[PDB]
Amino acid sequence: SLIPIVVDIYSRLLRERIVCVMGPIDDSVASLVIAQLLFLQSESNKKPIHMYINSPGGVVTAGLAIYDTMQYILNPICTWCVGQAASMGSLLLAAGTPGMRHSLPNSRIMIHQPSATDIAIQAEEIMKLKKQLYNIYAKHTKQSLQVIESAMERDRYMSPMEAQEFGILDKVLVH
Amino acid sequence: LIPIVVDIYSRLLRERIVCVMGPIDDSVASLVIAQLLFLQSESNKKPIHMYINSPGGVVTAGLAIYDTMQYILNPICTWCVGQAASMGSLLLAAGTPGMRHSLPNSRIMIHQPSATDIAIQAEEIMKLKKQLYNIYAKHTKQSLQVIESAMERDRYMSPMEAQEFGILDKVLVH
Amino acid sequence: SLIPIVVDIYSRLLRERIVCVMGPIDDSVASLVIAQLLFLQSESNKKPIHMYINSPGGVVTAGLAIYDTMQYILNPICTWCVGQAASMGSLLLAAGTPGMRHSLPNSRIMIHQPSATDIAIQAEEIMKLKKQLYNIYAKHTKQSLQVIESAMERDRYMSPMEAQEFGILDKVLVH
Amino acid sequence: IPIVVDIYSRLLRERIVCVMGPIDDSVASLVIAQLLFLQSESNKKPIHMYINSPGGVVTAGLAIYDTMQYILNPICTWCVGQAASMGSLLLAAGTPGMRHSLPNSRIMIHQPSATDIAIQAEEIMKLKKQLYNIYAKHTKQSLQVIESAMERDRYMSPMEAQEFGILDKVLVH
Amino acid sequence: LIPIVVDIYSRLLRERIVCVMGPIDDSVASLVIAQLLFLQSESNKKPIHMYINSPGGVVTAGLAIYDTMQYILNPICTWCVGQAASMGSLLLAAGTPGMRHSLPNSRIMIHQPSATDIAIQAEEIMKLKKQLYNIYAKHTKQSLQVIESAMERDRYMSPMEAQEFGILDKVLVH
Amino acid sequence: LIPIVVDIYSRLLRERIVCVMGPIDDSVASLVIAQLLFLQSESNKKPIHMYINSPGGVVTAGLAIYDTMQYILNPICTWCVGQAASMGSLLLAAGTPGMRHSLPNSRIMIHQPSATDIAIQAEEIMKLKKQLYNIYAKHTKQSLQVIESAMERDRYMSPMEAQEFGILDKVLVH
Amino acid sequence: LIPIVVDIYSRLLRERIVCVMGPIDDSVASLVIAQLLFLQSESNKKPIHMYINSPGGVVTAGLAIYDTMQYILNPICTWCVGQAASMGSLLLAAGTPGMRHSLPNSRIMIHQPSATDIAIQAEEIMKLKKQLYNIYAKHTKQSLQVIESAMERDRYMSPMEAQEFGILDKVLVH
Amino acid sequence: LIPIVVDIYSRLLRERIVCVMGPIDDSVASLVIAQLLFLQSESNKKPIHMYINSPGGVVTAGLAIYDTMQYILNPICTWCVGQAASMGSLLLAAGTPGMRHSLPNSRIMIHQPSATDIAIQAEEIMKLKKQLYNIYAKHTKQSLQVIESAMERDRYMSPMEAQEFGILDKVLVH
Amino acid sequence: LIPIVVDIYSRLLRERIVCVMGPIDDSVASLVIAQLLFLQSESNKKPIHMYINSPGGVVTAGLAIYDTMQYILNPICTWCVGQAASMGSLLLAAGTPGMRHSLPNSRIMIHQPSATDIAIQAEEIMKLKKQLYNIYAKHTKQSLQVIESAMERDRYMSPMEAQEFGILDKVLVH
Amino acid sequence: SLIPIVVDIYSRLLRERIVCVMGPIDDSVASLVIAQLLFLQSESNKKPIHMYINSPGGVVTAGLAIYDTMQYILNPICTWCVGQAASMGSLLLAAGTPGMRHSLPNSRIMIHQPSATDIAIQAEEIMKLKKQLYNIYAKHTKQSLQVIESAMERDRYMSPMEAQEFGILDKVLVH
Numbered sequence A, C, J: 001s002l003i004p005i006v007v008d009i010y011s012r013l014l015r016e017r018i019v020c021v022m023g024p025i026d027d028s029v030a031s032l033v034i035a036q037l038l039f040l041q042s043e044s045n046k047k048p049i050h051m052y053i054n055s056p057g058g059v060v061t062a063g064l065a066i067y068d069t070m071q072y073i074l075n076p077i078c079t080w081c082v083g084q085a086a087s088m089g090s091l092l093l094a095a096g097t098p099g100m101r102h103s104l105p106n107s108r109i110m111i112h113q114p115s116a117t118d119i120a121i122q123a124e125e126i127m128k129l130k131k132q133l134y135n136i137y138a139k140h141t142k143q144s145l146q147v148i149e150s151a152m153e154r155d156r157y158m159s160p161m162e163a164q165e166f167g168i169l170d171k172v173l174v175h
Numbered sequence B, E, F, G, H, I: 001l002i003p004i005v006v007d008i009y010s011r012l013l014r015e016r017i018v019c020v021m022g023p024i025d026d027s028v029a030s031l032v033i034a035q036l037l038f039l040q041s042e043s044n045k046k047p048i049h050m051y052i053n054s055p056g057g058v059v060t061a062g063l064a065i066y067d068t069m070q071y072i073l074n075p076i077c078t079w080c081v082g083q084a085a086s087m088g089s090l091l092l093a094a095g096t097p098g099m100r101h102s103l104p105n106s107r108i109m110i111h112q113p114s115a116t117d118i119a120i121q122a123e124e125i126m127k128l129k130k131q132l133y134n135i136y137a138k139h140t141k142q143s144l145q146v147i148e149s150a151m152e153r154d155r156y157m158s159p160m161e162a163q164e165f166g167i168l169d170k171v172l173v174h
Numbered sequence D: 001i002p003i004v005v006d007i008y009s010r011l012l013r014e015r016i017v018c019v020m021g022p023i024d025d026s027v028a029s030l031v032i033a034q035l036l037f038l039q040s041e042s043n044k045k046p047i048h049m050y051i052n053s054p055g056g057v058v059t060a061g062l063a064i065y066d067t068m069q070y071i072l073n074p075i076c077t078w079c080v081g082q083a084a085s086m087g088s089l090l091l092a093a094g095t096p097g098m099r100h101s102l103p104n105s106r107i108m109i110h111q112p113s114a115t116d117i118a119i120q121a122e123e124i125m126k127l128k129k130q131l132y133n134i135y136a137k138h139t140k141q142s143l144q145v146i147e148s149a150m151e152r153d154r155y156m157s158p159m160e161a162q163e164f165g166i167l168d169k170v171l172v173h
Ligand SMILES: O=c1c2c(n3ccnc3n1Cc1ccc(C(F)(F)F)cc1)CCN(Cc1cccc(Cl)c1)C2
Pocket: A009, A012, A013, A014, A016, A017, A018, A050, A052, A053, A080, A081, A082, F033, F034, F035, F037, F038, F039, F040, F041, F067, F068, F071
């Protein structure tokens, strides 16, 4: 509700190839984001797609569904963190095309996983998910598994500069 | 809410894309069934694509979709993104042979969770589970014994081991 | 994301002479179903009207309202059971035109009544209603009154092929 | 709850354990404790068990059943009001010749459509088959007739229950 | 709280007064049955008095009390004050002949309101109603036809109309 | 609810007027951010007007709007009507210098109330609090020490006094 | 549930009739303000009519409307129907002098109820009452003392008492 | 609602019969521990009997009871009636060797349900399962592998399967 | 509920055993404080035993117990069974040196979860966090830097590893 | 519940002339505390009474009711702050007999009033209450009104040392 019409603002964002992942991640967000990503690739397999992330995280399998769609599609993907990017949110941020992951000056980044689950699962599977994130995180930051898991073991946010040095993003820009 | 293009969920249907992601209930089954029959009227032979990201749901609602997939003449490509558990993996395994896919980081589970339209007797719950035994055995080409033994474990499968088991055919990445 | 549009899908099903009854049978479902049947008869008193049934049952008087409407209209009525047809659902399925009652391979049929009432009723009327089902069931299955009453007391589901042998449906189709 | 020269504590002084309600784990524990206490008082004096239950958790009912067979005491079961599902199983498990009903009591063996924990289909069936053998044992009915009867969602009269083997005597006073 | 006398509800039991004031449920049934069995153990022949001010309740719980009244050897005086509807009037009518009482302004109803422990079938609810037909006919000395015909009307009866019907015998003022 | 004029909230947007009335959360932030980014596409440097009547809200959502205001090239005139507390006053103070306004009877508060998207540790709440210090110090031209002292007090300030503090520049009447 | 004409509330605003019926909160305030600013853009000189049937509301939101009325150049006729209490009567008294009206049975109360957007200190609520004191004193042209004593009485006023006090100018029936 | 004898649950504890019926939580654990420590103070050598009818519960609370059994010097006879699942079967298997019993129809399950006192990380839940693995392996005398494969199956065991697996020693009926 | 022995929780107190099982709040703090102050009155220097199986709780309530332990003259043996997290581990580490124990399968965590009596500012939460640093550093004999690093990690430690960290001194089995 | 018996611990505290004001202040706490204070004076008008405070504050009129009882009774009153003493709690702490107000090392003290009310009242009365506290606070700390109101205007806790220097208490003791 209370969405203005322009000549619809969220639909007008999509004509600029901008997908929003604001808010928590659940299955409905994942399907909606995925549909827009596949739609944007069908318009052009070569024009860049932009993703604005202001998310506290969400369901792990729903987040991996988006991540896999980003890897699948051919388009370069520029990720933009505004507000914060925590848990799966920071993973999507880190999953952008190298050199095209940006953050605003006062944005917050967190890779620690929250202490999320569609259905009840056992620790053998919940741990498989955590390692699944380890390898994904290690891939895109170019850090060893020892470095990724140790950082994520600590509950703390990073400044946009700090997430750049750890390897989550490439550019902390102001204007 | 849902953005408008050139509505995006109607636009997915415009490409012969049916989504069965999210939990399966009787109304979800009816809606999916309506879309499959509508797509068959467009072309009895052009392929239908079905995206699965479901943790399962009502068994009779899942079988309603399954029987509808088997009924229509169209080839059906199943695509597992996110995860497919319980009835979700059955629909995934029920795709056209050679046309069942998953993305690299997907979770697949055939184990049934401990879902029910009405309270039923124990003989019917066993009659229903036996129905799933035969369906899984049909499309995975595994014996009944290995299927019943497999679902006994409350564990998920990776897309590559699910392929060797016969639930899907290709783990693609682009 | 509740309803897709076709090039409305539930209105398009109605353009195809297909009435679908999935949710549980209540007064609001009955009125809406009845309206479509009278609408489809006004379009053509002779083209077959189709009924897709996937219901766990519902209000008995609301089911009889649909049942009575089926008998009244002149059209041949093809009933199609997908998923399941229990209590009033199976009564509607069995009330189709003879030779036109179908089920899909893995569907469930149950005539046992669950242990259904708009308002509070006395025991005497509940028995009058149960007897009402006996005659409707006995009529359309061509089974004895006794075999119907003993069958319904058993709390079991039956497969489409034993349901065909019982007389509730005629064709278990395979495509 | 009235005091007498406590009324439920006084019933236990008369070797009467009352169920009279759904079979919880808490009901089962309390009933089981009373049976073990009454046996320790006397392994040979009969214990009376009053049943007015619509059933309950199956594992909790089997817990009581296992305790009844364990103790050496003759057990007189008395069904007043009604005895459905697990309730009728306890009724039929009394000592032979000592299972009674009041004239207007209700007996039901049909199982309701054991939810301590959510369970699988294979285990749920293993559980009813476990109930079949107990009923088959104590009614002296074949396994086939027991399973067919339980599939019918009907109540029995105290005479229908006496002839079926669930009880032995329908008395008025 | 309950006042203390030198406890008032326990003092009523010392006077062979059982209270059935309030709706009938299984927990009420256990207490009434327990007190009746206790009072019989004190004396097989001294009369027990039963105070009824109930709007009815669970049918199986009411019949459980009814069966206990018939079982014990004691004469039972039923006293209806306030009102006695559904099972309340059945217990009232089930007193010893010549000892069923009402106060001038009590309400009596045999009509059943529109058995309630668990969901049951149509044949069982009808079997339960037929049991009520025979019991009422036994203690009112009316034919079955007049019992059911009367019960179809939910009118309440005056303690006088109920006496002529056979539900009670002595409606007193002092 | 909302009137149509030859829609009133969309018509405010046609006049380059963004409204931040009400509490700030992530959904408010997304909408404000979208309108700010949209308004830049019509004109690189035409001024944008921002109406604030907010009691505050989520800090990360407030910083998200703040960063967007600083990012875009347009000069931004902020207008406080009613009140601007917590993050509300930060957005008000973050307008283009010389263009931060209040109406005569508005209340302004920079003290933060005792809020976050998720539960966080003590070190992060302090980092955010320090982040607010630096932003406030930057735009008020006050030292860090005086800013910290101002926020320590649970008091509101009048528009004409917020001007002397540096939160706004002009308190207008007509 | 709103009837449509050549929308009835949009047709009212189409004639410069702003409605403040119902309680004041921030969502009401934003809408009233937008309508006042919109009506000024069509004509800074055509009179605006404002209908008040409000029991009061949030004080900061009421002051926002008050500030918007004072800011715009239009003459504003306020019309009280039903009642105007707390902030409602403040908006009523804030109309253009000589253009404040009431209907015969409308009720006026200046007493403030015993709220605000957020929990605040005792000094801030007191700053607000003195702030309201001056507003009332300005437009009723009574001394500050007369306002404080009047608002202190938990009573409603008749439209004749309201004009004599200085809150309004005309009570018309036709 | 607990009957009194010369309290029935206090009379059970008076004979060294500790009951673990019902789900395990911290409040149950404290009480069981206190009873075990109390029974040891009367005699470090008289056997303690422990009745288990539990569907499981909090793992840390279950381990606290397990640690208390191992600490005290008394031989402990565990008795399974009804069922012993999750932590319940762990306490059952943790009895003194040769003194672990079950009744004929009691059910045993080692599969862990898909909780804990507080929300925790994936590594900590995994530390707990390996920790339970060693406990089960110790007292059933099966390899760690055999425990992990067994607990992986979402199935209950019969008392005969339970003794053969090493969880208990005797299934008695009399 | 609670057994009587010739009351079990009062009998633990007769043995100078205070139990801190369950979460800590002000009502828990008052009761523990009262028992600690009471136990000092029987004996100035007889050791007091403290059983901890707590996931933490209110920080000011936890410090209230901590200050009482430090205040009283008695040596205090702390015993961790089950788990001791957040304030729970602080009380465990606050025992008399050489007398802080854990049972083999206990879990210990000093990281604080992301709690307070009333809503507070960022400066106070940090002062309390720093207060916890100094207490932890004092009793573990670790530097402030290593303590802050330990608490930053959302992990539990085993009893034998908490010993090397200095939280406890002896992990006992019998 | 779960209160141990000693040979009752809260009743045994009262035989040691120790009143507990732990938890929030409401009318029921005030009456209960007041009754114990009057009882302790009736036992001895000259033996000291001890008050343990671990309170986040509460209803202002209920707190003033306790304060007035402390001033009325003749006994010396030793106040002890453990945990924290906020809003009205710190007022009761400050109201002890001079030289007999103590705190434990890690206790928290706050005079700022929370942002509490039996019934809805106007600002003229709510402000009268605040000034009523100003004069009470100024009395027992011996600070000017300007100093009291300015300190209380700032939202912050004090360390037990800091509350001593401001004048709330006299002794920060450890053993
Ligand atoms: O300003 C951009 C930016 C991008 N971008 C990509 C393609 N076009 C653009 N434009 C132009 C444009 C946007 C929206 C619309 C319309 F839809 F609202 F009309 C019309 C034109 C990329 C990233 N971003 C950076 C950014 C700044 C502030 C907050 C956030 Cl979260 C991120 C700016």
